[PDB]
Amino acid sequence: KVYLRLISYLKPYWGVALLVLIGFGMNSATEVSVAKLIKFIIDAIQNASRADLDWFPLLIILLVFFRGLGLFMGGYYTAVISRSLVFSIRQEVYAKLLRLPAQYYLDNSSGHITAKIMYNVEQLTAASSESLKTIVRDGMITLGLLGYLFYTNWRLTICIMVFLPVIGILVRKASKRMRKLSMQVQDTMGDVNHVVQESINGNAVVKSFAGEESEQERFYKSSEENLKRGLKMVIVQNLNSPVVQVVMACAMALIVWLALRPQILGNTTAGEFVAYITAAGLLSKPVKNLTDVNEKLQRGLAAAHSVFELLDLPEEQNSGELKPQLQGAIRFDHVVLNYADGTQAIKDFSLDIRPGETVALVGRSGAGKTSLVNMLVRFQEVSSGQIYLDDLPIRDIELSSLRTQIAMVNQQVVLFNRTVRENIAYGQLHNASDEDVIAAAKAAYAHDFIMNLPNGYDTVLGAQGLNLSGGQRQRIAIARAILKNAPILILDEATSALDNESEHFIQQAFDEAMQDRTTIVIAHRLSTIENADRIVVMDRGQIVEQGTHQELLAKHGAYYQLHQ
Amino acid sequence: KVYLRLISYLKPYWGVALLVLIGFGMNSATEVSVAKLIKFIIDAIQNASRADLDWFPLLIILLVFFRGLGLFMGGYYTAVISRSLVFSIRQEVYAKLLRLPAQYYLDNSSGHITAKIMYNVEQLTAASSESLKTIVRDGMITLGLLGYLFYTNWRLTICIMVFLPVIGILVRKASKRMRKLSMQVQDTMGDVNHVVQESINGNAVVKSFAGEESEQERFYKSSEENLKRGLKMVIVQNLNSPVVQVVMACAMALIVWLALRPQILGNTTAGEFVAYITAAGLLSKPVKNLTDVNEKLQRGLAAAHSVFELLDLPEEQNSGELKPQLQGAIRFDHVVLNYADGTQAIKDFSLDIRPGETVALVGRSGAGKTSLVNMLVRFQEVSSGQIYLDDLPIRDIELSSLRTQIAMVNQQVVLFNRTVRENIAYGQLHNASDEDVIAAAKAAYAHDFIMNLPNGYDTVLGAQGLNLSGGQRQRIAIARAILKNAPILILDEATSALDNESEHFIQQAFDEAMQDRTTIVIAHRLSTIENADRIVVMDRGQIVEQGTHQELLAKHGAYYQLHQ
Numbered sequence A, B: 001k002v003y004l005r006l007i008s009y010l011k012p013y014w015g016v017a018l019l020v021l022i023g024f025g026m027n028s029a030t031e032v033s034v035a036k037l038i039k040f041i042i043d044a045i046q047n048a049s050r051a052d053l054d055w056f057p058l059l060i061i062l063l064v065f066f067r068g069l070g071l072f073m074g075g076y077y078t079a080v081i082s083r084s085l086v087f088s089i090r091q092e093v094y095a096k097l098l099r100l101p102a103q104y105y106l107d108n109s110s111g112h113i114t115a116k117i118m119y120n121v122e123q124l125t126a127a128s129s130e131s132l133k134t135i136v137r138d139g140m141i142t143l144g145l146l147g148y149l150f151y152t153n154w155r156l157t158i159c160i161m162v163f164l165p166v167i168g169i170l171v172r173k174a175s176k177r178m179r180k181l182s183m184q185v186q187d188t189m190g191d192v193n194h195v196v197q198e199s200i201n202g203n204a205v206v207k208s209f210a211g212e213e214s215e216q217e218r219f220y221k222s223s224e225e226n227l228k229r230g231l232k233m234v235i236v237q238n239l240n241s242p243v244v245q246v247v248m249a250c251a252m253a254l255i256v257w258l259a260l261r262p263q264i265l266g267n268t269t270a271g272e273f274v275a276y277i278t279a280a281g282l283l284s285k286p287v288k289n290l291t292d293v294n295e296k297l298q299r300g301l302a303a304a305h306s307v308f309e310l311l312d313l314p315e316e317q318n319s320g321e322l323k324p325q326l327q328g329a330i331r332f333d334h335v336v337l338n339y340a341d342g343t344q345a346i347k348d349f350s351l352d353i354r355p356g357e358t359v360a361l362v363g364r365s366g367a368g369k370t371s372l373v374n375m376l377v378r379f380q381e382v383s384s385g386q387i388y389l390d391d392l393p394i395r396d397i398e399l400s401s402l403r404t405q406i407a408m409v410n411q412q413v414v415l416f417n418r419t420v421r422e423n424i425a426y427g428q429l430h431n432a433s434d435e436d437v438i439a440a441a442k443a444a445y446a447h448d449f450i451m452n453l454p455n456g457y458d459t460v461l462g463a464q465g466l467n468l469s470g471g472q473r474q475r476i477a478i479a480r481a482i483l484k485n486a487p488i489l490i491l492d493e494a495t496s497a498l499d500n501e502s503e504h505f506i507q508q509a510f511d512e513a514m515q516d517r518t519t520i521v522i523a524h525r526l527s528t529i530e531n532a533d534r535i536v537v538m539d540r541g542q543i544v545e546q547g548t549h550q551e552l553l554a555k556h557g558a559y560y561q562l563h564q
């Protein structure tokens, strides 16, 4: 249950959880004394007393002081507990979100995912910090003053326990509706976030094709739906608070009718009954506030359900092992890549890559080039197969120990909005050295244009590194990959947008490194493949042919086709 | 001023803006009657009256009905007005955000921009919808009760107008502190959003380099800073509401001391003084509520300032013109691209492109390849130069009329998370035809794998179209570009990730189109450049050489270097 799990998050706050009770507890004892205060002043003034009459002024300053000190400490602690608990929620949510599999990222766009911690969790803050204080107040205060009301006269008060089911039904019935609608408005917000996020991502596409008008219609429709849902939610919530007062007002009228009969009014002591009316009003107000905060309470519950679903989602796994890979020799054996959608791209595959080799994959597009690499780094779980990395199961090695020792250059190079040095030295090697980055840049051929930048290595990039160049942005990935001195360098189309001269120097640097690795090259070119130790012709996953550059040319086959 | 401009947004709501006042006005009158109700009941009971005693119960259900009907109608209208106003804000904010220049997108990442409408505007909703009602109540009700208080006894009430400067200073002084801090917390949230958005974008990079631990520290630091700022803001708020009660409580103590002197107590008629105390308490409660909601009120103002800064930001411009471009002939003349950062890449450039030509740009990377293209589409304003599109100024043509008739293929292909058919037919041509998409796919060579997809042309893509393939994702851009039948096709590195076979068919289709255009090709290859009508060798912006494929080879120069 949502409520049960929330309590588990405030376990270390029990010591502070009772201080807030005391602070409002004194406040609960402050608003009950007013009923006694009115009776006391009426008795003193009615009897023309002077000793207890001139003493009244000191009783409101002292009384109000309790409405202050005690209200602040109790009122301020509510924010502390709720804000601290949410801080441990969003912070802990980030860990699982980062540890989630790449498949989850594919299914949900940035707008949907970001709204789940930026808005979903955000509403939980205002729905908990403000709601917890309001509910505990409109609780303990009402409880205390109603207990006092029972003590002064139990006979009349017991009549109040007749309409209680009516208020319960009017609130329970009026709460399930908002709970159902609360999840709907949150879902609509995700669509709103998705449209803006996609528009930001595709600004280049949006402006080029004059799609701004089309984007507005979808965003306008989503905003209209959200507004209608909010207005509908307001109708039910705002309709409940006045109604619950009407039934309580009828109860007050009935109890007054019962009490004010002449046979019961023989000796009333009006000062006593006016205290009763004041207590009744001081119950009516807090219950009205409790009914008003119903929307705030319900909003948090809907957010909590989605948050905990995200927490329970099936994140990645681990095995436990630590090895240096001794120049890991990757040996695929009957590996398949049956995707969730249904497409099959690694139907059949097998290799015996040896340490120090330069195996490269060449073939037609849409065959599984950048799909087999993912399972090597564990970005995609294997199906009906396994990989023997260093003559041992790949799964047995930890993800941290595996990804940290495998340099990668993705087809779509991603650059963070930070300084150039941080991007080149991003990751576990953020504290490598102040000169290692220079060596990596020189090897990658990026040590010529960085100095030409306005600031140099400490220049902040753009939104996604668009401001460097069409080709320079790619060199940053190569630079960081070479900086990461792992004995693996999967150059997955690393030299795609680079110029003829720039790529030639990078190939020369790779050849001259004199630190032979098991680098895998996936390039749609012959210059990089001409020097490959072994060339594997792959089409639709199946290995069409294998051999060296000379062997394939003599055999012709499919390689001869890709030689025009 | 923020307040002045906000009123301008509710101009058409003046008809409903007065109905809410009546609802609160009736509610305000109800709050007045309670003080009269206590006096009436005490006078009736004190005199042992029966005609006005048994009639009292009918004055509670009727009185509460006014606390209902009137509170609901006016209470629900507050949400309607505020929610409708914000709906016209976020909806109108979207238009300017989409019309903003590409430079603004570069400066601010997605997280900063998205948080300015998803959180900045979102806080304005709760800071206005639930704040406007609270201020209207803590106003009308208090004003009416105070007017009644003055009427019954003006002599005593006048003493209240001494502490008023004290409460004003305690509130005015405490308001600027939160206003300054309100902007700080909002700024911190933008950093929180930035980390999450960048992590979502770079999940491939984050996982590959084991950077999850590094990301957590930055996110953890931002969350801690936000929590500390919020806690500091909470201290200011909760420390104000009890204090204003203390000074007001002292005022009431002094006034009661002045009033209760024996000389003034000759004929007190206790029933009237208890009404005085009830009015005093029912004034204390709403002012406390006003102080409490001061926090939400201040939160909205900080958001409003940033929102209006975004609204006032310098969006793009327009001129006003319409033409078919008659196969627009591009004639660059003394064009420069002095960037905002400072780098220069179009130092010198001039051309006389003619209709039906196939001019292509070839040169070294980092020279200005994908920077001059932005001019023709107005993604970047020209400096100390101009472009004559159809022997007329480019600026004179409307942006919509210009972008809508210029097919573009950006180096970084962006695919939206939608169906394939919508993505291929995205933009002004969303209603082209049910068969034209097939022709475009066949021309681009994309009508071979789409049918092999799980659903086909109506299959939802991933977050950014990552699930097609490394090369297929590029073909979608080519498909939409060819579908858009403008007399321009700037193939800016269109064939980069495509294989040798796919690119050949696309080139053949372009040649066979038999619809000669002014297509511009920016490719680091020779297959597309061999058949180019004119080849321009560009280095560092300056035109190194011009001529046909045969001419450049004979002249050697830099072209001979780019031939190995």
Ligand SMILES: CCCCc1ccc(S(=O)(=O)Nc2ccc(NC(=O)CCNC(=O)c3ccc(NS(=O)(=O)c4ccc(CCCC)cc4)c(C(=O)O)c3)cc2C(=O)O)cc1
Binding pocket: A030, A031, A034, A038, A059, A060, A061, A063, A064, A160, A248, A249, A251, A252, A277, A278, A279, A280, A281, A282, A283, A284, B030, B031, B034, B060, B061, B063, B064, B248, B249, B252, B277, B278, B279, B280, B281, B282, B283, B284
């Ligand atoms: C200008 C100076 C400000 C500063 C200051 C000024 C003063 C101080 S102080 O030291 O004196 N402190 C207080 C003084 C007065 C007060 N207040 C009073 O006595 C009235 C209390 N409410 C009422 O009697 C009342 C009664 C019935 C009402 N409506 S009903 O009959 O329909 C109805 C009745 C029952 C139900 C539910 C039935 C469930 C069985 C439903 C409907 C209403 C209404 O309509 O709201 C109101 C409080 C304090 C304090 O301690 O909180 C301290 C500081």
Ligand SMILES: Nc1ncnc2c1ncn2[C@@H]1O[C@H](COP(=O)(O)OP(=O)(O)NP(=O)(O)O)[C@@H](O)[C@H]1O
Binding pocket: A466, A467, A468, A469, A470, A471, A472, A497, B106, B339, B341, B343, B344, B345, B364, B365, B366, B367, B368, B369, B370, B371, B372
């Ligand atoms: N927003 C920008 N801020 C600063 N410099 C920029 C910006 N955009 C481009 N440049 C520079 O302008 C020059 C041209 O780069 P670009 O627009 O990518 O064309 P290009 O480099 O010739 N194509 P490519 O070789 O694939 O990068 C380079 O020196 C870039 O660093």
Ligand SMILES: Nc1ncnc2c1ncn2[C@@H]1O[C@H](COP(=O)(O)OP(=O)(O)NP(=O)(O)O)[C@@H](O)[C@H]1O
Binding pocket: A106, A339, A341, A343, A344, A345, A364, A365, A366, A367, A368, A369, A370, A371, A372, B466, B467, B468, B469, B470, B471, B472, B497
């Ligand atoms: N997440 C996915 N969902 C569905 N199909 C996928 C997914 N990832 C890859 N595929 C398919 O698997 C095949 C392999 O594609 P991909 O992983 O891009 O390697 P590739 O096509 O050989 N490299 P490239 O030629 O540059 O695209 C293609 O048919 C893709 O459509």
